[PDB]
C-alpha cells in the first residue's frame, strides 16, 4: 500500500505549470519531454516588439504586478498579470483533468484585457511556444485547409515513451484579428493565426526568445529581398507575422495577432484517457477548482483575531497561492568543484586567501544530470532550489498538503552525494544557469546550509503521532505509509548529521578550552572577512579576523535541531543503538552551549574565537545569532537564560521595533553598516521562529509564561501588519522590512519565506 500511494502521487503531480521562471508555461516532472511557454507584446512600430515582448519573469517600473490568485498543484489555479508597458491585464487559468495512464490531461485559458490607458485598437502579438526533447518522440502540426494560416484551431499530434499518444490544441479564440490591405497579403495572407514547425538540437530548445526572433528576422530578410520597402511598407504587425509553415519538428511556434481584447485556450488531451478535452471542460474544472481551493483554505488557514476580516483573507490567499505556485521542476547538470583542494579544510590563519587561490584553479566540472521538484524564493530573482529556504517554504505547504511536502523533501534528499552533502543552491540545466553569472554557479562540497528541512519533518512526526483530499493526507492517515517513508529517508538524515560533524567541526582540544564535552563544537566553513554565506545570514557580524578557532552558536544549535529529530524518528523505527548515541550528543550540546557560548556579562549567547594570545574569547553582537538556542527550541521553559533572552527580545533599544525583531541590535557597533543586509532589517523567517517559540512558552506552565504571552501577541501582530500594509500598498511580499519605516526593501515577489505570515495568522501551533 506504500507503493500504491507512491504511484497515485506520481500520477497526481506529474503535470503542472512547473516553470516558475516564466510568466506562464507547463512541463511535466520528466527531464526530457514536452514544454510550453507564453509570450506577448504590443506592436506599435517597426522596432518596438523586441523591447515589449514578455517571457521570463522580471520586476521593473513597466510591470505593476503578477502572481497566482489561487493554486493547488494537484488541480491548478488562476494567475493575474498586470503589465503597464503593454497596457494589458492578463489572466492565465490552468486546470488538470485526471484520467488515462500518463499523468492526465490539462487545459489553460489565456485572457488579455486592455487597461484604461491602452489605445482601444492596440495590436498585441501572442505566441504559444511548444518544444519536445527526446530521441524517439514525435510532434506534428496538422496543416490548415486555408492557404496562409488558420481560420480555426491548431492541432498538434505527438507521441513519446513518457507521455504515450497526445494532442495539444490551440483554439481559435475570441477577439478582433486585424486585416491588412497591403500587397504583401497576396503572399502572406491578410492576417491569420500561423504555425512554424522547426527542429534544433535538443539542448537549445529552451531558448524560446532567440529561436522566435531568429524566425522573425528571417521573415523581415525575406521582405527586403522581395522588394518590400519604405516606399510603401506593410503595417508593423504584418511585418512581424511569420510565414505559415506547419510540419513536424521538435519546436512549434503558434502566433496570433489581436486588436483589442482577446482570449484563447490550450487543450492537452492524453489519448490514453477518456474522450479529448474541450473548452466546456475547462470552464467547468476552473469553477470546480475555485470552490475546492476556497473550502480547503478556510479549514487549513483559519485566520484568528485580529485577522479574521476579509482583507486579511485576500492577503493570506495571495501569500499562500504565490508560495505554492512557485513550485518548479528542474533538470540538468550542476557545476561542482570536486577537487577537494586541501585549502578548503580552512585550518590556517588567513585561510580565506588560500581558498581564493584554490578557487582560482577552476577545477569545477558539470556533473549530473539531476532533477529537483521544489518551491523557490522569488520567481524574478531566485527561480531555483535553496536548501535552508525550502525548510521555511514547506511549513505552510505541509499544512495544505503533507504528501506534497514529503515529495519535495524526498526530491531534495535524493540529491545528496555519498559523503552526505547537498549543495545549498540547486542550479540545474542551461536554462537555470542562464540567469546566474558564471562566477556564482559553482557549488563547493564543504559549504553547508541550515538543515531547516528537519523542522518540516518534526511537524510531520507530531502529526503522525496524534481523491485529492485523500492523497494530500495519505501519509498521515495510513501510518504504515508514514513510517516506510521515514524508514527510507532515515539513513540519509543520519548521513547528513554525520557529514555536519565531519566537515563543520570546531576546534576544542587544540586550545586552552574547558568544556563538558570534547566532541561538540561547530564552525561554518566558507567564511570570508566580510561574509558567512553558508550560515544563511550573509553579513551578520562574526569574529574578526575569521579564524580556525571560531565557534558559531547558530551552527551548534542547528546540530541540536537535527539530533532532536533523529531521536524522534529513530525511536519510531526502534533504532536503539542510534537513539542512545543521539541522547549523549544532545546532552553534550546542551552543556556545551552554556560552557562555550554563554556570556554571563552580556546575558545572551555569542560566537567564540581565539585571542591574539591564544585564549578563547566570546564575541557578542546582540541580534538574531544571540537568541539561536531559543529559536531552535533547545532551552528548557524555566531556564534563567531563557528569561534573560526574553528581556533581550522585548527591549526596544535592542531588537524590538514596531515592525518586528531587528536582525541586529541598535546598540551594536555594526548596526546599519556595510551592505546592511542582516545588520538591522526585519526578516520574516527568523521572526517566525521567535513567534513559534514564544507561543510554546506562553501555552505552558512556568515562570516566563505571561511575559511570553505578551511578546507572542504583540510580535504576531507586528509582523503580520508589516507584511500586510506593504502588500496593500505595493502588491508584493518583500525579502526584508525596514525597522525604522516599516517599508519592504530588497527583492520583491519573495514567496519565499515571507509567506510564513499565513501560518502566523492562522496560529494554534
Ligand atoms: N547585486 N547582486 N549581487 C550578487 C551577489 C551574489 C550572487 N550569487 C550568489 C547566489 O546567492 C545569492 O543569491 N545572493 C545572496 C543573498 N542571500 C539571501 C537570499 C537567499 O540566498 C535566497 O533566498 C537566502 O537563502 C539567504 O539566506 C539570503 O541572505 C548574485 N547572483 O546574481 O546570483 C548576485
XYZ file of C-alpha atoms in Angstrom, residues 117-700:
584
model
C -4.562 53.746 -20.755
C -4.256 51.489 -23.813
C -5.263 52.682 -27.313
C -8.591 50.864 -27.959
C -7.058 49.428 -31.136
C -3.704 48.240 -29.776
C -2.108 45.413 -31.685
C -0.774 42.675 -29.415
C 1.309 39.692 -30.625
C 0.696 36.485 -28.712
C 2.838 33.380 -29.084
C 2.437 29.917 -27.697
C 5.769 28.059 -27.903
C 5.985 24.263 -27.800
C 9.076 22.088 -27.596
C 9.784 18.393 -27.113
C 13.083 16.769 -26.160
C 13.711 13.037 -26.606
C 15.414 10.773 -29.151
C 12.369 8.645 -30.087
C 9.482 11.117 -29.894
C 7.382 12.977 -32.431
C 5.246 16.123 -32.724
C 3.321 17.409 -35.737
C 1.098 20.346 -36.667
C -1.872 19.184 -38.736
C -1.814 21.686 -41.683
C -4.697 24.089 -42.291
C -7.361 23.990 -45.033
C -6.621 27.658 -45.872
C -3.603 28.919 -47.784
C -1.762 31.208 -45.430
C -2.615 30.045 -41.908
C -5.542 29.046 -39.710
C -9.157 30.270 -39.572
C -9.799 27.885 -36.638
C -7.988 25.675 -34.132
C -4.380 24.455 -34.392
C -3.911 20.760 -33.622
C -0.546 19.286 -32.763
C -0.240 15.484 -32.727
C 2.643 13.978 -30.775
C 3.902 10.789 -29.155
C 6.642 9.782 -26.725
C 7.533 6.844 -24.394
C 6.852 9.101 -21.348
C 3.519 10.542 -22.493
C 2.152 7.984 -24.982
C -0.157 9.460 -27.628
C -1.451 13.009 -27.105
C -2.916 16.039 -28.828
C -2.342 19.719 -27.944
C -4.879 22.148 -29.394
C -4.561 25.947 -29.551
C -8.099 27.194 -30.113
C -9.225 29.964 -32.486
C -10.312 32.185 -29.591
C -12.400 35.354 -29.242
C -11.147 38.756 -30.439
C -10.661 41.002 -33.450
C -7.962 39.747 -35.745
C -6.622 42.713 -37.798
C -6.564 42.623 -41.617
C -4.048 44.218 -43.988
C -4.785 45.741 -47.357
C -1.123 45.541 -48.328
C 0.245 43.955 -51.498
C 2.037 41.587 -49.106
C -1.329 39.978 -48.199
C -1.283 38.327 -51.646
C 1.729 36.246 -50.488
C 1.306 36.200 -46.688
C -2.475 36.393 -46.324
C -4.429 39.394 -44.904
C -3.845 38.221 -41.301
C -4.499 34.896 -39.532
C -3.093 32.519 -36.901
C 0.147 30.920 -38.094
C 2.357 27.972 -37.140
C 6.033 27.318 -37.804
C 7.390 23.837 -37.092
C 11.212 23.604 -36.707
C 13.955 21.370 -35.335
C 17.016 22.295 -33.241
C 19.475 20.111 -31.281
C 17.544 19.184 -28.119
C 19.787 21.094 -25.707
C 18.832 24.558 -27.048
C 15.029 24.092 -27.270
C 14.627 26.071 -24.014
C 15.887 29.292 -25.638
C 12.460 30.286 -26.929
C 13.132 34.003 -27.298
C 16.175 33.750 -29.612
C 14.553 30.911 -31.564
C 11.464 33.046 -32.149
C 13.491 36.138 -33.041
C 15.641 34.169 -35.488
C 12.397 33.362 -37.348
C 11.122 36.978 -37.278
C 14.437 38.185 -38.592
C 14.322 35.707 -41.477
C 10.766 36.882 -42.285
C 11.978 40.510 -42.444
C 15.043 39.484 -44.500
C 12.592 37.935 -46.961
C 10.650 41.236 -47.176
C 13.832 43.143 -48.004
C 14.804 40.538 -50.613
C 11.369 40.554 -52.288
C 11.253 44.366 -52.716
C 9.000 45.405 -49.804
C 10.383 48.741 -48.596
C 9.791 52.228 -47.179
C 8.302 53.476 -50.430
C 5.205 51.651 -49.129
C 5.769 49.403 -46.034
C 3.231 46.862 -44.725
C 1.940 47.658 -41.204
C 4.283 46.696 -38.289
C 2.146 43.824 -37.090
C 2.192 42.241 -40.543
C 5.995 42.588 -40.754
C 6.207 40.581 -37.500
C 3.747 37.865 -38.546
C 5.576 34.682 -39.510
C 5.017 32.943 -42.846
C 2.893 29.838 -42.144
C 4.964 26.594 -42.444
C 3.437 23.829 -40.282
C 5.015 20.398 -40.322
C 6.905 18.161 -37.998
C 9.781 19.053 -35.686
C 10.762 19.431 -32.027
C 9.784 23.146 -31.971
C 6.343 24.584 -32.855
C 5.623 28.327 -32.818
C 1.950 29.277 -32.780
C 1.429 33.009 -33.393
C -1.722 35.150 -33.195
C -2.257 38.875 -33.586
C -5.130 40.550 -31.769
C -6.652 44.021 -31.978
C -8.346 44.909 -28.722
C -9.158 42.295 -26.057
C -8.512 38.596 -26.643
C -8.802 35.093 -25.226
C -7.822 31.614 -26.403
C -7.454 28.167 -24.888
C -4.849 25.432 -24.840
C -6.197 21.884 -24.501
C -3.798 18.979 -23.884
C -5.554 15.633 -24.360
C -3.892 12.435 -23.186
C -5.015 9.827 -25.675
C -4.912 7.068 -23.050
C -7.754 8.865 -21.149
C -11.475 9.292 -21.904
C -12.562 11.470 -24.850
C -10.465 14.520 -25.628
C -10.616 17.702 -23.510
C -12.915 20.532 -24.627
C -13.255 24.239 -23.826
C -16.525 23.477 -21.979
C -14.469 21.059 -19.853
C -12.002 23.836 -18.958
C -14.691 26.244 -17.694
C -16.237 23.522 -15.519
C -12.952 22.487 -13.952
C -11.868 26.114 -13.369
C -15.132 26.780 -11.451
C -14.804 23.475 -9.556
C -11.148 24.136 -8.612
C -12.033 27.532 -7.112
C -14.713 26.019 -4.833
C -12.295 23.278 -3.694
C -9.499 25.798 -3.027
C -11.894 28.067 -1.086
C -13.109 25.313 1.270
C -9.589 23.969 1.971
C -8.300 27.452 2.707
C -10.925 28.026 5.405
C -10.161 24.695 7.154
C -6.357 24.772 6.865
C -5.699 28.544 7.143
C -8.380 29.641 9.576
C -7.117 33.105 10.424
C -7.526 34.091 14.074
C -8.057 37.536 15.657
C -7.444 40.264 14.819
C -7.048 38.959 11.276
C -10.448 37.335 10.673
C -11.505 40.123 8.274
C -11.907 39.573 4.510
C -8.993 41.950 3.747
C -6.564 39.681 5.608
C -8.198 36.665 3.961
C -7.468 38.000 0.473
C -3.949 38.789 1.778
C -3.439 35.244 3.131
C -4.684 33.618 -0.125
C -2.267 35.800 -2.059
C 0.732 34.940 0.124
C -0.160 31.255 0.137
C -1.005 30.835 -3.545
C 2.203 32.550 -4.634
C 4.408 30.383 -2.407
C 2.889 27.096 -3.552
C 2.601 28.370 -7.112
C 6.362 28.858 -7.147
C 6.824 25.066 -7.188
C 9.048 24.170 -10.089
C 10.624 21.115 -11.741
C 14.260 21.419 -12.763
C 16.515 19.017 -14.702
C 20.164 19.082 -15.840
C 23.817 19.348 -14.818
C 25.292 21.321 -11.886
C 28.708 22.933 -11.647
C 30.660 21.436 -8.722
C 34.295 21.833 -7.647
C 35.164 18.212 -6.862
C 38.913 18.928 -6.326
C 38.518 18.904 -2.521
C 41.638 21.106 -2.504
C 43.278 20.856 0.951
C 42.908 24.662 1.270
C 39.139 24.177 1.737
C 39.950 22.479 5.058
C 40.480 26.034 6.416
C 42.950 25.076 9.138
C 45.343 28.019 8.861
C 45.149 31.625 9.950
C 44.367 33.633 6.798
C 42.618 30.624 5.210
C 40.370 32.835 3.077
C 43.356 33.819 0.868
C 44.290 30.176 0.445
C 40.768 29.170 -0.526
C 40.556 32.003 -3.084
C 43.753 30.559 -4.638
C 42.111 27.110 -4.743
C 39.039 28.631 -6.416
C 41.327 30.319 -8.936
C 42.325 26.864 -10.189
C 38.820 26.369 -11.675
C 38.639 22.561 -11.414
C 34.863 22.774 -11.400
C 33.082 20.492 -13.922
C 29.459 19.932 -14.911
C 28.023 16.791 -13.365
C 24.564 15.147 -13.304
C 22.048 15.255 -14.728
C 19.974 15.851 -11.596
C 16.318 16.600 -11.023
C 14.577 18.641 -8.337
C 10.939 19.392 -7.526
C 10.898 22.384 -5.205
C 9.364 25.725 -4.282
C 11.542 28.862 -4.825
C 12.307 32.162 -3.003
C 11.447 34.508 -5.889
C 10.143 33.986 -9.445
C 12.017 37.008 -10.946
C 15.237 36.897 -8.907
C 15.733 33.398 -7.463
C 13.888 30.719 -9.540
C 15.739 27.686 -8.199
C 16.044 25.488 -5.110
C 17.726 26.924 -1.981
C 18.424 24.500 0.848
C 17.544 26.390 4.026
C 14.800 28.427 2.297
C 12.981 25.206 1.486
C 12.759 24.391 5.181
C 10.608 27.517 5.566
C 8.649 27.206 2.308
C 7.455 23.731 3.312
C 5.988 24.748 6.652
C 2.736 26.227 5.203
C 2.821 23.853 2.260
C 2.840 20.914 4.709
C -0.316 22.208 6.375
C -2.000 22.302 2.999
C -0.805 19.002 1.514
C 1.563 16.955 3.668
C 2.127 14.415 0.863
C 3.251 17.223 -1.385
C 5.748 18.491 1.204
C 7.142 14.966 1.679
C 7.519 14.671 -2.105
C 9.659 17.799 -2.104
C 11.748 16.549 0.818
C 12.248 13.236 -0.964
C 13.262 15.151 -4.041
C 15.806 17.176 -2.025
C 17.212 14.209 -0.174
C 17.651 12.274 -3.478
C 20.314 14.845 -4.395
C 22.635 14.003 -1.519
C 26.077 12.690 -2.552
C 27.836 9.690 -0.954
C 29.519 11.996 1.624
C 26.151 13.429 2.807
C 26.388 16.818 1.022
C 23.581 18.705 -0.713
C 24.552 21.972 -2.437
C 22.851 24.980 -0.866
C 21.784 26.302 -4.292
C 20.473 23.932 -6.981
C 21.200 25.404 -10.421
C 20.153 22.535 -12.765
C 20.445 22.841 -16.545
C 21.372 25.583 -19.041
C 18.009 27.299 -18.584
C 18.562 27.702 -14.823
C 22.198 28.679 -15.425
C 21.092 31.387 -17.834
C 20.093 33.835 -15.050
C 23.155 33.275 -12.828
C 26.577 34.872 -13.615
C 29.357 32.262 -14.142
C 31.259 33.469 -11.037
C 28.383 32.310 -8.825
C 27.334 28.962 -10.314
C 29.961 26.705 -8.719
C 28.948 24.744 -5.634
C 31.516 23.571 -3.081
C 31.222 20.230 -1.150
C 32.493 21.938 2.036
C 29.665 24.563 2.040
C 26.782 23.697 4.396
C 23.441 25.440 4.965
C 20.994 25.343 7.915
C 19.119 22.000 7.991
C 15.700 23.690 8.125
C 14.085 20.735 6.406
C 14.266 18.929 9.743
C 11.695 21.423 11.063
C 9.178 20.217 8.474
C 9.932 16.614 9.369
C 9.229 17.476 13.017
C 5.747 18.738 12.078
C 5.186 15.502 10.192
C 6.272 13.314 13.148
C 3.904 15.123 15.573
C 1.024 14.791 13.109
C 1.835 11.096 12.662
C 1.881 10.727 16.489
C -1.565 12.366 17.121
C -9.442 11.591 -4.096
C -7.265 14.718 -3.916
C -8.320 15.295 -0.311
C -7.362 11.643 0.334
C -3.988 11.814 -1.421
C -2.973 15.059 0.279
C -3.119 13.409 3.735
C -2.485 9.752 2.832
C 0.897 9.816 4.562
C -0.593 10.536 7.996
C -3.886 8.628 7.607
C -2.003 5.411 6.705
C 0.642 5.053 9.472
C 2.384 2.166 7.691
C 2.897 4.542 4.760
C 4.228 7.309 7.061
C 6.724 5.012 8.693
C 8.073 3.495 5.494
C 8.760 6.998 4.234
C 10.747 7.745 7.398
C 12.487 4.347 7.135
C 13.768 5.103 3.620
C 14.692 8.702 4.493
C 16.221 7.965 7.924
C 19.612 6.727 6.566
C 20.092 9.921 4.579
C 19.213 12.163 7.527
C 21.800 10.220 9.531
C 24.360 10.610 6.765
C 23.733 14.371 6.755
C 24.069 14.569 10.549
C 27.463 12.845 10.338
C 28.578 14.975 7.402
C 27.999 18.095 9.533
C 30.142 16.620 12.323
C 32.877 15.714 9.846
C 33.048 18.829 7.696
C 31.792 21.604 10.026
C 33.658 20.633 13.224
C 35.170 23.261 15.530
C 38.461 23.015 17.437
C 38.149 22.346 21.184
C 41.112 20.036 22.024
C 43.937 22.094 20.444
C 43.390 25.120 22.690
C 43.073 26.239 26.326
C 39.352 25.381 26.130
C 37.495 23.943 29.105
C 34.068 22.418 28.493
C 31.814 19.488 29.425
C 32.252 17.549 26.136
C 35.399 17.374 23.986
C 33.372 16.485 20.875
C 30.757 19.245 20.457
C 31.796 22.454 18.707
C 30.981 23.749 15.257
C 32.370 26.277 12.803
C 30.833 27.131 9.396
C 33.233 26.511 6.550
C 33.317 29.128 3.799
C 33.638 32.351 5.673
C 35.289 35.462 4.250
C 36.394 38.611 6.057
C 33.035 40.149 5.272
C 30.562 37.305 4.931
C 29.406 33.892 6.060
C 27.091 32.875 3.210
C 26.741 29.282 4.408
C 25.008 30.267 7.683
C 22.160 31.890 5.719
C 22.857 35.179 7.474
C 25.125 36.658 4.902
C 26.752 39.663 6.578
C 25.700 39.231 10.159
C 28.822 40.348 12.129
C 31.138 37.496 13.127
C 34.570 37.354 14.916
C 37.269 39.459 13.186
C 39.520 38.276 11.815
C 37.957 34.917 10.774
C 39.970 32.230 12.447
C 40.169 28.389 12.547
C 39.306 28.571 16.243
C 35.915 30.249 15.681
C 32.867 28.525 17.060
C 29.399 29.532 15.862
C 26.438 29.259 18.231
C 23.917 29.156 15.355
C 25.598 26.089 13.767
C 25.730 24.215 17.094
C 22.029 24.944 17.626
C 21.159 23.606 14.176
C 23.033 20.411 15.167
C 20.768 20.278 18.198
C 17.718 20.591 15.927
C 18.919 17.613 13.924
C 19.646 15.389 16.920
C 16.210 16.061 18.323
C 14.526 14.786 15.121
C 16.973 11.905 14.783
C 15.829 10.868 18.296
C 12.136 11.188 17.347
C 12.439 9.239 14.097
C 14.955 6.680 15.391
C 12.512 5.853 18.204
C 9.700 5.277 15.706
C 11.955 2.828 13.872
C 13.340 1.276 17.086
C 16.969 2.067 16.182
C 18.041 1.940 19.793
C 21.830 1.756 19.298
C 21.381 5.062 17.401
C 18.934 6.732 19.833
C 21.403 6.275 22.681
C 24.208 7.949 20.708
C 21.866 10.853 19.906
C 20.954 11.332 23.585
C 24.611 11.710 24.625
C 25.179 14.291 21.869
C 22.059 16.266 22.848
C 23.223 16.213 26.495
C 26.671 17.400 25.406
C 25.338 20.196 23.170
C 23.131 21.485 25.995
C 26.084 21.699 28.386
C 28.463 22.877 25.697
C 26.201 25.755 24.557
C 26.479 27.050 28.111
C 30.193 26.254 28.537
C 31.390 27.680 25.244
C 28.773 30.202 24.110
C 27.046 31.852 27.100
C 28.110 35.335 28.178
C 27.077 35.929 31.788
C 28.209 39.581 31.295
C 26.057 40.364 28.255
C 23.175 37.990 29.100
C 22.946 36.154 25.751
C 24.726 33.605 23.540
C 27.745 34.548 21.455
C 30.133 33.205 18.846
C 33.692 32.456 20.059
C 37.223 32.853 18.628
C 40.801 32.637 19.872
C 42.723 35.765 21.021
C 45.992 37.318 19.841
C 47.342 35.435 22.902
C 45.630 32.119 22.049
C 42.819 32.239 24.672
C 39.088 31.648 23.987
C 37.212 34.989 23.655
C 33.423 35.399 23.324
C 32.374 37.991 20.707
C 28.871 39.366 21.260
C 26.804 41.073 18.653
C 23.308 41.329 20.073
C 20.949 40.096 17.382
C 19.362 37.019 15.826
C 22.507 34.889 16.405
C 22.319 35.721 20.139
C 18.901 34.033 20.505
C 19.721 30.953 18.465
C 19.485 28.378 21.329
C 15.979 29.734 21.961
C 14.769 29.994 18.323
C 15.653 26.345 17.644
C 13.774 25.102 20.727
C 16.704 23.882 22.894
C 16.208 25.817 26.181
C 14.046 24.375 28.992
C 10.898 26.522 29.748
C 12.119 27.514 33.235
C 15.686 28.457 32.318
C 17.145 31.731 33.728
C 18.989 32.027 30.421
C 15.635 31.996 28.578
C 14.295 34.756 30.850
C 17.361 36.867 30.036
C 16.744 36.331 26.295
C 13.090 37.326 26.743
C 14.421 40.564 28.163
C 16.631 40.968 25.107
C 13.832 40.248 22.632
C 11.442 42.614 24.388
C 13.868 45.545 24.668
C 13.006 48.383 22.261
C 16.517 49.804 22.435
C 17.993 46.457 21.235
C 15.896 44.246 18.929
C 12.222 45.180 19.383
C 10.935 47.529 16.689
C 7.285 48.429 15.989
C 7.738 46.331 12.848
C 9.299 43.088 14.196
C 12.630 41.976 15.724
C 15.672 43.698 14.140
C 18.329 41.328 12.779
C 20.931 43.224 14.841
C 20.725 45.476 17.949
C 20.698 49.256 17.582
C 23.323 49.152 20.342
C 25.745 47.028 18.298
C 28.562 48.976 16.609
C 27.784 47.124 13.385
C 24.176 48.346 13.232
C 23.247 49.616 9.771
C 26.809 49.226 8.452
C 28.220 47.941 5.129
C 25.537 46.390 2.956
C 23.180 46.396 5.950
C 21.642 43.093 4.919
C 21.427 41.176 8.189
C 22.708 44.100 10.187
C 19.360 45.672 11.160
C 16.431 44.785 8.802
C 13.469 42.641 9.946
C 13.383 39.154 8.364
C 10.236 37.058 8.497
C 11.861 33.592 8.639
C 13.658 34.400 11.920
C 10.673 36.348 13.252
C 8.585 33.219 12.531
C 10.927 31.076 14.616
C 10.602 33.543 17.509
C 6.825 33.727 17.272
C 6.635 29.898 17.446
C 8.947 29.621 20.467
C 7.184 32.468 22.325
C 3.882 30.634 21.815
C 5.372 27.439 23.224
C 6.306 29.135 26.490
C 3.002 31.027 26.610
C 0.801 27.886 26.493
C 2.708 26.009 29.195
